[PDB]
Design a protein around this ligand. Structure first.
Ligand SMILES: CN1CCC[C@H]1COc1nccc(-c2noc([C@@]3(C)CCCc4sc(N)c(C#N)c43)n2)n1
Ligand SMILES: Nc1nc2c(ncn2[C@@H]2O[C@H](COP(=O)(O)OP(=O)(O)O)[C@@H](O)[C@H]2O)c(=O)[nH]1
Ligand SMILES: [Mg+2]
Length: 168
């Protein structure tokens, strides 16, 4: 049977979670997508010759630490922690998202990838070295992406699938 992978995209508002997810689903750059819409989207993909079913949850809205929201996030098997390379605050928030994932999954080894988005822009404020060194502190991969140009989009999602496969 075809394996389904439940992936969750997290990070500050405005980093490009929706743009990244829609590039994967539609193969098109969407510069405008209602910042309040949180929803899930499926796509069949060939990753290393195997057709698998991705189920991507694109998160949005206010932080809520209810038993219901924890249960909803606990459905994720792997997480993309996204920041924007021209927004220092989004990068400085990443540790919070990682700590919340570790708590809900009750595990120090949850499949995760650090994503530096907006790599097409010239306004960089977060050095690639600092981002690579944060992923090294966590023991996870780092991928540079652009939802505008498609840079790194399959690398981010497919690497997360490969981290889930090794975790099982
Ligand atoms: C002063 N703040 C703290 C630093 C940044 C600043 C603002 O932080 C901020 N803003 C919005 C959302 C979040 C946020 N953190 O984790 C989560 C998720 C979705 C991640 C996945 C695992 C869980 S489990 C659960 N219940 C969640 C929820 N709501 C989550 N989202 N953080
Ligand atoms: N140049 C550029 N802008 C992007 C990129 N990804 C998203 N954006 C823009 O960043 C803003 C926020 O994007 P959105 O996908 O709504 O972020 P979300 O709140 O994390 O879902 C919008 O103005 C998008 O056009 C990218 O890689 N490059
Ligand atoms: Mg969004």
């Amino acid at each position: 049977g075809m394996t389904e992978y439940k992936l969750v995209v997290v990070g500050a508002g405005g980093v490009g979670k929706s743009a990244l997810t829609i590039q994967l689903i539609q193969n098109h750059f969407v510069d405008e997508y209602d910042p309040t819409i949180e929803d899930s989207y499926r796509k069949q993909v060939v990753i290393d010759g195997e057709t698998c079913l991705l189920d991507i949850l694109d998160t949005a809205g206010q932080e809520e630490y209810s038993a219901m929201r924890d249960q909803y996030m606990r459905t994720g098997e792997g997480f993309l922690c996204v920041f924007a390379i021209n927004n220092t605050k989004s990068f400085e928030d990443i540790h919070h998202y990682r700590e919340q994932i570790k708590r809900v999954k009750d595990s120090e080894d949850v499949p995760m990838v650090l994503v530096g988005n907006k790599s097409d822009l010239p306004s960089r404020t977060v050095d690639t070295k600092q981002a690579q060194d944060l992923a090294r502190s966590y023991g996870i991969p780092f991928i540079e992406t652009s939802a505008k140009t498609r840079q790194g989009v399959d690398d981010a999602f497919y690497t997360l699938v490969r981290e889930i496969r090794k975790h099982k």
